Amino acid sequence: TNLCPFGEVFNATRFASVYAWNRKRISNCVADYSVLYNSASFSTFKCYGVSPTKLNDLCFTNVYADSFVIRGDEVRQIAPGQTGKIADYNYKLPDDFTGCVIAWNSNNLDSKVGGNYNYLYRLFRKSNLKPFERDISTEIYQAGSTPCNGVEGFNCYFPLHSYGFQPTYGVGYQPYRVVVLSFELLHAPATVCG
Amino acid sequence: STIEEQAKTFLDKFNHEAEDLFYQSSLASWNYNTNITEENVQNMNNAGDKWSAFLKEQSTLAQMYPLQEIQNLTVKLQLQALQQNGSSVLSEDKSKRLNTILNTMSTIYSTGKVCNPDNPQECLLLEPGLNEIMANSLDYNERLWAWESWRSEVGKQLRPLYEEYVVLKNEMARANHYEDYGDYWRGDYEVNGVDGYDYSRGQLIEDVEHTFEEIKPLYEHLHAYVRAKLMNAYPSYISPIGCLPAHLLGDMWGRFWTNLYSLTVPFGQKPNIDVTDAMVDQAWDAQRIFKEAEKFFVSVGLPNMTQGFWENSMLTDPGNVQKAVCHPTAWDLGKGDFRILMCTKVTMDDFLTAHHEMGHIQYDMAYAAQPFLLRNGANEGFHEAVGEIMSLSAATPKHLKSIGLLSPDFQEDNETEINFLLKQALTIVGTLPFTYMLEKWRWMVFKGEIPKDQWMKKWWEMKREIVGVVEPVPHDETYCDPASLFHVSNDYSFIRYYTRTLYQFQFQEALCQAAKHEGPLHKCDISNSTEAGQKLFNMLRLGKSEPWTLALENVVGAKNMNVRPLLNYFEPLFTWLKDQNKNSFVGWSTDWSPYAD
Ligand SMILES: *[C@@H]1O[C@H](CO)[C@@H](O)[C@H](O)[C@H]1NC(C)=O
Ligand SMILES: *[C@@H]1O[C@H](CO)[C@@H](O)[C@H](O)[C@H]1NC(C)=O
Ligand SMILES: *[C@@H]1O[C@H](CO)[C@@H](O)[C@H](O)[C@H]1NC(C)=O
Ligand SMILES: *[C@@H]1O[C@H](CO)[C@@H](O)[C@H](O)[C@H]1NC(C)=O
Ligand SMILES: *[C@@H]1O[C@H](CO)[C@@H](O)[C@H](O)[C@H]1NC(C)=O
């Protein structure tokens, strides 16, 4: 009966960086995606599997809302069947995706002259991520054969690097806040619909 | 595990470092360039030193990667450009000696000044004093005085300085397995490791001498015509067979000949084409000029300027409140920021310079996808060529009428087109002998093919044999008259202008032939023909991730610099000069002198 809390997640004031993409669970509520679809504020709105209208009158067991910030160009990499730094090392979308992808420009807040260095992304990794796996480690990267034991240097690299967000960036480099939704159906009753 | 993947990882870190640091440096330099104060100088110099120190440290750290162990030619090109330590290889005392002599020469040239024997307190920097003196004053003695005075004041100073600089730079080049500094510069065109597209550094010299040999007739007839006109202007000074005295070349050295136009225009009663009045009478301002050039570039299918350019750039002089040194420049601040810095005075010349700089901006927008080290021209000459072709394609009378900015009934005729082509050939065809002569002299100097105490003796020789120039005053070995120039004194490569000029007309003719234009090449316009647009974009989007010969054949279908498009473009002018020259001797003797008569 009570409304789903899309408010506190969709436009709060501080999003989590991509490598620690903030996940939130949605259940036991009624959802109204119509304001979302007709908002016309998001400069990127795409998804795969359900119609933006029909999803309003459908019932699901649990919903998951991932949220983070990325660069402009790289927003395309959030899609089943892409590859790249965000799809390789930082986030994974399974090709059997079920949710939706919402992306809106964020040059409003997330950037400030002198560079906003609070947003990070994982630049190197030994292997590519699995679907919906999040890695927060920061162990120095063994680029060579000699182990490093936690030191920066030749063939020993730091695995996190900071987005140099500024307000004077092109459209492909101004930040972009992104929310990705997924639904799942199980044996239990579908407590999420409206 | 291997060397390839590890160099991959390393460069993948070096990018996301150098991008940020280069943004900081370039943004600080921009803030300085629009608002000249002390604190901006501070921020700019600190950020620039930080960036340069990062670059040096990264070069040193990168030389630990074995080059020949690399196959993927992108990684090999980036590693080659990065690992070249350069001046960082000398002994530190020698490095400080280099910086010392460089700063002395640069500052001496940037502040040197001259005045007549009558008022030792009323005197001028070259710009704009000696500039306008050589540019508009028609007094023979005045111009000769300016000539000898500027050739004596900075020349004798930098002469031994330039000797020492040549020595130290030869050492710097030989340190990194480059036979001399000339070869170091030529190492920009060098291409290896690609079958059917390799290019050796001496192959460049061969090609340049070749192309100049074929251009020689056009320039010789141009010089004959101009000598005839100047004899009609200064008969008591020029020989009907002797070379042209340099101090009449509409400039202190003759980099261009533009200022001779009014002095040599054939049909001096013809109203020249100029839309200045037509521009102002329609309330044309900065925003309008640049919107028009942007609409041009959209016409041929290239993408249009992102909003950042309209918001951030400086199109209009910032009044008298704050000052800026607005030589018209285009800035790629990286990370998707493009700007233009220009004090646009509403004229025609500026309506062309706007197209030129916006073409630079288009070329930079094209290859924002290539990794950092490749975000540049394919060679040191593609940028200015891609710039110039747009200006010459949008300066045509047909295009001018197309935007209504010209009276639709202005009638093209032989007279106006000969005037237009003479303007062009005085701008472009005049500068090629000068560029080639100077670069060849500097190469020969660096190769040790000349004793030092003989430099000047050889220098004016080549002009006497190439550019038809003769000095009105005997200059001895204490001068270093070439040093009196910007690029000579500031140590810049100078053949990029030759390569720009020739690639310009290759590109222009290929693009027109892609637009199915019928008629003379000069009246061609590329507008509304998306075919030429895509044909050019297929070369733009590469950067330097490919050998320049490959990107050149992607457009002109040739594999080398080739003059034939130039001669094609100038054919009507060449015929007209052949008619006009039947009454004058073409060529020059090498013994006639203005001072030893
Ligand atoms: C949150 O506020 C922003 C800014 O007005 C708006 O774009 C967005 O649509 C809002 N969220 C929802 C769910 O409408
Ligand atoms: C120019 O620089 C000065 C010194 O920092 C600054 O006070 C001024 O605001 C700048 N000009 C503009 C238009 O911001
Ligand atoms: C060379 O490396 C780039 C990425 O740096 C890659 O896209 C390209 O495929 C590589 N070349 C070959 C022949 O695999
Ligand atoms: C560039 O041209 C396209 C043509 O479809 C247009 O949609 C777009 O708005 C133009 N860009 C700008 C910044 O106006
Ligand atoms: C280009 O096409 C537009 C629209 O078709 C037209 O208004 C303009 O005059 C054309 N310009 C040229 C140079 O063909």
Numbering used by the authors:
A (entry chain E): 333 to 526
B (entry chain A): 19 to 615
What do the study authors state?
Specially, single (N501Y), double (Q493H, N501Y), and triple (K417N, Q493H, N501Y) mutations in the RBD were identified in MASCp6, MASCp25, and MASCp36, respectively. All three RBD mutants could bind to hACE2 with affinities at nanomole (ranging from 500 to 20 nM). Interestingly, compared to RBDMACSp6 with a mutation of N501Y, RBDMACSp25, which contains an extra Q493H substitution, showed an enhanced binding affinity to hACE2. Meanwhile, the atomic structures of hACE2 in complex with RBDMACSp6, RBDMACSp25, or RBDMACSp36 were also solved at 3.1–3.7 Å. The same as RBDMACSp36–mACE2 complex, the interaction region could be divided into three patches, the three adaption-mutated residues (K417N, located at PI; Q493H, located at PII; and N501Y, located at PIII) were located at the three patches, respectively. The extensive hydrophobic interactions in PIII were constructed by Y501, T500 in the RBD and Y41, L45 in the hACE2, salt bridge interactions in PII were formed by H493 in the RBD and E35 in the hACE2.
